[PDB]
Every structure is written in structure tokens, then in C-alpha cells.
Amino acid sequence: PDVGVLTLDAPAASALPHRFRTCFFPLTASDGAAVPSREGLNGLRVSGSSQFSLAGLALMREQFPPRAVIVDLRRESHGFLGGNAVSWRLPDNQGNPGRDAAFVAEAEAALLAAIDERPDIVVAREARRGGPTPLTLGPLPAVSEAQAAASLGLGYLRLAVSDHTRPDDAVVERFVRFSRSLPPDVWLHFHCRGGAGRTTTFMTLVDMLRNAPSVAFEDIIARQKALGGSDLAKTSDGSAPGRDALARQRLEFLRRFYEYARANPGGAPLGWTAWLAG
Amino acid sequence: VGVLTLDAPAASALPHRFRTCFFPLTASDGAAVPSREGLNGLRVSGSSQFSLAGLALMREQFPPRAVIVDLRRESHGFLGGNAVSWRLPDNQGNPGRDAAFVAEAEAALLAAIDERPDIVVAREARRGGPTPLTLGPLPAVSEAQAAASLGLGYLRLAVSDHTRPDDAVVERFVRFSRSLPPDVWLHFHCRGGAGRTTTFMTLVDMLRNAPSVAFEDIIARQKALGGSDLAKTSDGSAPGRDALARQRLEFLRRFYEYARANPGGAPLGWTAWLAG
């Protein structure tokens, strides 16, 4: 089976990851662009980013509140080689297709163990990340993000979400139950590879779980973009019907979730699965 | 697979053998207090296996940036608030396997009891037995997820009960220790809070204090804090267990020597030092 091209997500020298934002980040009105509703946004105890280097994680920790949790949304196998964030990229970044976080953790641990402290590990670089010339790295220590988070005293939760896709119903169920289990002081920092579709989706889910009964759907979508996320409602001008007709299923899900969070504020009395069955 | 056994009932609060490096030692008439030098500043605590309520209680007094360090090689997790595990003979579950493998095998076992009725769970005499419990349907979660739900760090290191840690586990732990910022607190636990928890609290002690504190005082103070006596043996009633305890002591003195030569785990790692 194809395990993917070992690819660079973030060089070790990178600091704050791209698309980093917290729910306290500014939304500023422009002449021809009004600010969406701010109601309930600041109190969400949530932030997000793209994939960070180890140094980027240590920098972010300087501003994380107590009892912060890194929520890793990547279904693809990934980790760190030295300070570098690296991943195994299948076509369209569909690593570990359909597999849950428990499988992903072991598969990725096996791949990281194979590059741990080996010289001459060749790491592909996308054109957008300083390529196309690959990097040759090693011998460097290879660690999972779970270990990186633990080494900083940070919580860590893995949820397997395929890039460019909505979360599976089983992941949404697990996340709602996780959200309900949290004491009031726990902060969630979401990340994926790019900090766009997946991170923005889950920050939106957190937003809806608190604010769906009192804030309009389009304002929640709009403000997660304005904070620094991606636009979950945007489409191309027709240049990419597939990519456009893929955000479609995700937007349908987000409205299905918005309705659920209005019927079950905070995820209660019914969970996601039950509500769907009803 | 192992016998599904209870580690801690959901109703249990503070786990047994809970202690921090700030806990009192205290002098008795016929039992002197060992050296306290370097003990309070170790940023370490330990306990036996906790329930979910017990973890939440302990979190009330954990410092910022605390890590649960789970030393259990055996598969285990939570059924509702109850801590449960799958016990092999003498608790030798997942023999020779590393943390990554244990987590996946463990995940499948927990999934098999998640929200399922009529789960029979054995209870040892020292844990409310011999009569078992029947539980379910209750949610099953890993300790990794329980820690995350509280905003606590989590590290799994696979150590066999009643045994010393393998060299690969020691190497991983020393590298982990060196990677820590100064403010990170470690809370170790195993099943009973005795042998394995006390061994790793001792390793943390040695990594900071081996150059300045006598080997026997480190062993003695980890016992006096609330840990087990790593120097103890039976009166002849348990020669097999005594053999393991001595070999564990051989390793601890071998580690003590490593930590005087490489304070804090530097310049040489454990495997590197062994190779020389």
C-alpha cells in the first residue's frame, strides 16, 4: 500500500504558524465590509492554526491559558523530525482513508520510528513551502505530536478528519461528547495542515455549540473567516467545480449541525448521532 | 486477552499511595529521616491508578503544565468512572510491547466494552472482591482521552509490573526529561503506585540529585514520601519477587552511576553510556 510522500509541513525555523487566531482576535469594520455579529465570540475558549513546528508550539504555549488542549484534526500520518513538522501525503492528502484516530496513531508511530535518527532522510517540499527542491535531513529525533504536546504540559486530542472534507458522523459524535466532558476552564487549540477548512470547521462547531440559539448561521460562518479562518461558504468562479461541489457537502453539514445545536444547546439533551436518528 | 479487572471503582476519590515531592517525611524514634536535599524541587508526584473522579480531584492541586505519565504496559482505561484493566498472569500484559502498540490494542478492547450491557468485571480481594461487578452500558474511554478532557498532558511508557524498565523505555524517558521546559510537572502512576511509580520518581530524583545525594538516601526518601521500599526483600517467602527487586536495584544503581556521570541526562544518553 502507498503510505504517501514524506513531505514538509513546517520547517524547524518557522515560528508562529500561519493562520493562527484566537477568539479574541480583532474583527474590524471597513467601509464596504461590515463586521458580523460578535455576540458570544470572545468567550468561546478556542483558537486555531495551521501545522506548527516544535518551536512554533513552544511559542504558542507562552500565550496558552492553563489547561489548554491541542486538538489535532489530521487523518494523515504526521509528526516531527527534529523541529520540522513532516507528513506523509497521499494524492489530495487522503492519508489513512476512512481510518479512526487509534489506527492513525499506530500507523504514524511506525512511520516516524522508521525515520528516527536516520541520516539522509529526503523530505519533499511543495512549491508553496520553499520547494520544489527537497530537503535532506537527519539524523534527527522523530516524535509524534502527542509526545511534543506532552513534553510541554499540554493536552492532546486526535480526531481523524480527511483534508478538504467534513468530519465523519463518528468524529462529530466523539467531539460533541468531548466538548460536553470539558470543565469550564479548558481551552481548545485546533489545527490541521493549513489551518483552513478543517480547523475553521471545528472552530465553527465550537461556536455553534455555544451560540447557535442566539447567533445567525451566516454570522458564525462570517466571523470565523474574519478571525483568520477560511471562508466555509466561498466558492470559485467556476474554475474548480469539484472543490466547490465539495464544500457543498460540508456547508450542508454545518447547517445540519447549526440546527442540531439549536435543538440541543451545548450538545444536550441529545447527542449528534441520536438527533440524526430521531 | 486478559481478565477484565477493576483497578479503581468510580466512587473512589484520591487514589492510594498519592504523594508529591512536597509531602512530609518525619523522624521516628527508631527510623531516621533520609536527606531531604534537592527533594522538594523535583516537580514530581505519583499515585496508584485513579478513577475519573480521582483524576479530576487531583487536577485541583496540579500545577500548570502538568503531565500524567502512565507507566502501565497492560491494556487499561475507564468504563464509566471505573478504572479497569485486562490482567495477564502476574499482570504481565502486552509482554515486551511499546506504548504505541499498547495504545491500539487497548483502544480495540475499550471499544468492545463501550456502551455495552452485562460487562462482568473481576475484583481482587484488596479491591472489594472476590465477588465481581456487572457494569454497563457505560462509556469507555482511554486515559489519554480522560487526561485531554481535563487539559492535562499525557505520556505513556510501557513498563511491566514488578520489573525494571527496559533500556529503550529508559532512553525514551531520559530524552523526554531533557526535553521538558522548567515549569513542567510530572505525575507518575502505574496500577498500585508501588514498584513502577516509585522507580520512576527515583529516576527523576537521580537525574537532578545523583551527584549530591547518596544512593541510599534517594531510595529511602522515595519510600518515606509514600512510595514502596525499592530496597526491601521478603524474609524468604517470595524468592522470585525478591530476585526481581534486586535486579531492579542493580538497574537503579547502574542508573545512579549514569546520572552522576551525565547529570540531568547529559552529555551522554542512557543507551550511549551503556555502549561505552
UniProtKB/TrEMBL annotation, chain B:
Tree of life domain: Bacteria
Annotated residues for binding of 1D-myo-inositol hexakisphosphate: 17, 127, 162, 191-196, 248
Segments passing through the bilayer: none
Name of the protein this chain belongs to: Tyrosine specific protein phosphatases domain-containing protein
Annotated organism of origin: Solidesulfovibrio magneticus (strain ATCC 700980 / DSM 13731 / RS-1) (Desulfovibrio magneticus)
Interval of the full protein contained in this chain: 52 to 327 of 331
